[model samples]
Target chain A: SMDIDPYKEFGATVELLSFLPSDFFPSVRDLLDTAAALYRDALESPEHCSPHHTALRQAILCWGDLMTLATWVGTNLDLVVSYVNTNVGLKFRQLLWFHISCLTFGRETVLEYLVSFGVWIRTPPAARPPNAPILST
Target chain B: SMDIDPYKEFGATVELLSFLPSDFFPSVRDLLDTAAALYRDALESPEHCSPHHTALRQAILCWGDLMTLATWVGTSYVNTNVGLKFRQLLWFHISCLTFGRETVLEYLVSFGVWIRTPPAARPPNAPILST
Candidate 1:
């Protein structure tokens, strides 16, 4: 029996998930659970699906599923943050998207920003380009 | 004498600054700085440059500047995560980009898998994803 933890990925079932606003998806746990059931049924049905196929479908589903989640989260970020107990989760998501490419190998412009940011954060102001503009508005 | 914390508006900047990346330009700071200087000089020398003209030029300049930054950052990530620190930064970057969208952007659809990755201290899984 898989010990399911919505927040835990490995040792459970999830390998990849989607990015959706909380308001867009009202129930995070439920999303995971539903996905889990669908996946299990698909897998157990003797569908003879390739691992790659499964992974791809999962990824696609994750984002498609996220539309609802995004609406929920976007509309109620403040409330969700208050419920989540820290700004790190929110920051983590914000920072990742800012730097990483998303949505079907979208683009890495965001990731590029992260590299520069990571470099900037670690290196002292003196080491950074003197004329670099403030990243944030 | 401008103090740019870069943290306070971090989220806002992510949302707005990233939009320019679609065009493959880079360098947000450069664009802004140029725009600011251009506007300032234009203001001081309105006889030489019209305010509206300066604003238009600045807007274009800003886009190019941001595009440059995007490309630069993208290049760094393309090289691969050479170190744990690099990977963490990269992962965080992905998370932010997903989050950068209207919270309901849904990374999984496009991304497929957004694992509840372990803490930074813990090593990343065998594979973040097969792909």
Candidate 2:
């Protein structure tokens, strides 16, 4: 208790944020956005956007598109966006921005949606805010 | 080479058409239409739905969607059907029917989708049919 060092807790935040998604991790969408933004910055200067960028874009799109039907996110934009009210289209656009950023800039980002998991656990709403009206059960 | 009469290769085909939808299996959708049919049977049942049915339905839906997607079928029903020549959907529906029949008949079926890996080929157009 005599000596206090702050550097000891340095990696705690990033380390912790890395493991959450379903309950503790941020939304995959958020992480994709962050990475895309960084990549875009590098792209604007015509120095970034390498293989990593292509892979990220393909992965994000593949996941988003593939999971849409089963997740009941709606196969169509209007339905999904209107159902959730969080703007699936905007999320997708952000994803595209991520693609561009990655291609043009060469940076990356991560998800921040995990911030609300704690709040959600305390009050189980039966559905996600991003999928509020979509769950037909 | 002439003494092969006594050596016979016995291959058996268990028709899943005889199975019921309510029957439980480790993996349903993996069986292709056989699993989907079972799920459909459960859905159409008069039990008012059960947890088993829900889980099965979820798995089936996921598989169906993924099947079209993984295969690059399309974003819409028509496109998907057209892209794959409608065989995929037919097969999927058969699976659903199989599951349905099984549930109604209250018996198990051997109808399952087996994964078939093809030899490595080109990226764009590879003639590999999993069925």
Candidate 3:
């Protein structure tokens, strides 16, 4: 038996999949397949089972379940984008950046794709507070 | 003239980007250019500067200031731009979409059915896409 159902939340999360372009839905799904397959294969492996990949396991399983992280992304996409901007952790982490208070698993590449599509609301230069470093001053 | 340019950082944040095969970089960079310019124009408007457009202003300012979300894709000099891999990039966007930038402002300013939305709903005629 597999460690997770993998596609257990496919359609439901699709409803909240509002931020993404319709065409890319399949790519996101493909990555899901990648996560699911990788999760399954690892579950079958002697070294990856049970105690070893608890972190990776949880991340991959979460993507499959889409019960928590997916819901969070849909709940407030802007907040997550703002958080991603603040964290600046994607390039360093390689995989599984903290999204919506949970460790989301997948290639950083996939995460980057998500970031590119989200509302990248940048703070303006002039608007910086007086106390903050001002380039003009 | 100042020897050390300050706003040099204006768009430098986007220089190192390289996502997948190199063919699409041009198009993405162009889009980035368009988005960044749109953002810059917004920065100059009086009404746009008010608190009412804070989200739009913030997002655009951030996008442009950050330079199209940081030179993604082709950072390396060696060039792996051509391959079945390139096919993968187009297909991947085929996987990630929202009419592009408009929705990011108009609506979502926003994923899945799985571990909860099951794959059980697949149409018999539908082919599951992948690399």
Candidate 4:
């Protein structure tokens, strides 16, 4: 039986955030950034699942909790939708969707994100100038 | 912040299923009946949260997948749909799995699963009378 530590992806996503400019459209960026941090906090310790739970329950709770954070971002997609047309913004967009996508695939790593960058490099983010309000001036 | 482990509750619920008569109903009885075996299979490990990613993920995945099974039971079938007797039986099964034996007995009392009239305390060890 192949075992996969689902938590490994969270650390990978956090690492990727460094590649983007710090103020990459504050609202959505902040949401994802905050989510990454919270995921890490819950993942790194046993207490997040609590000692009271059996091992299987602990893992399920962790997966559910992280997915809940992802759902918040999904519901608030309007906050980031406008920014998807820009160069850097699209990267963040892909990254956002990538995180949401993880809930389905249940597995992905920073290496995959690195490779995905090549796909974007070939056909830059929409060529249309960014719709202003979403990006930081 | 206090962390609440949902799996612990799930495991506790699974444990309660073992107490029921094996052939409790049929569909639901089979579902809950099968659940306990699967839970024990995944839980019999030293490292459910194993250092190996594959093993850890496997355990987590097992737990999550089983929960989806339970959610189906909760949403699809219920009292009005199945009838009072079966519904109460299902509720007892669900309660035992969720809140432990206390909740199970509590539900039984509220639902009147216990005998309403005992056999009059058997007349202080006298020979049984043919009423």
Docking class for model 4 is incorrect
Candidate number with the higher lDDT (1 or 2) = 2
TM-score of 1: 0.19
* DockQ score for model 3: 0.01
lDDT of 1 by residue, A49-111 (tens): 332222223222323323434354576544433533232233223322321222213224333
Winner by lDDT: 4
* Candidate whose TM-score is highest: 2
lDDT of 4: 0.37
Tens digits of lDDT, candidate 3, B15-114: 1112222442334334334434444343333332322122222222222323333343123211132222222222222222313323312221111111
lDDT of 4 by residue, B1-131 (tens): 23433322323332333344333335544434443443334333333332222223333343344344345434322222322223223334334444564554554343232233345743333221111
Each candidate's root-mean-square deviation in Å? 25.7, 20.7, 23.1, 18.2
Residue A95 in candidate 2, Cα distance off native in Å: 13
lDDT of 4 at A5: 30
List the lowest-lDDT window of 10 residues for candidate 3 chain A: A1-10
lDDT agreement with native, every candidate: 0.31, 0.33, 0.29, 0.37
Of the candidates numbered 3 and 4, which has the greater DockQ value?
4
DockQ of each: 0.01, 0.02, 0.01, 0.06
TM-score for the A-chain in each candidate structure:
0.28, 0.29, 0.26, 0.24
Candidate 2, A1-137: lDDT as tens digits:
01111111111132233233323323556665565545434322222124333223333433444444435434343433343323233333333433343334333322222234434454556564644211111
lDDT of 1: 0.31
lDDT sort, best first: 4, 2, 1, 3
Candidate 2, superposed: residue stretches over 4 Å from native? A1-21, A41-49, A67-137, B1-65, B68-131
Worst 10 residues of 1 chain A by lDDT: A7-16
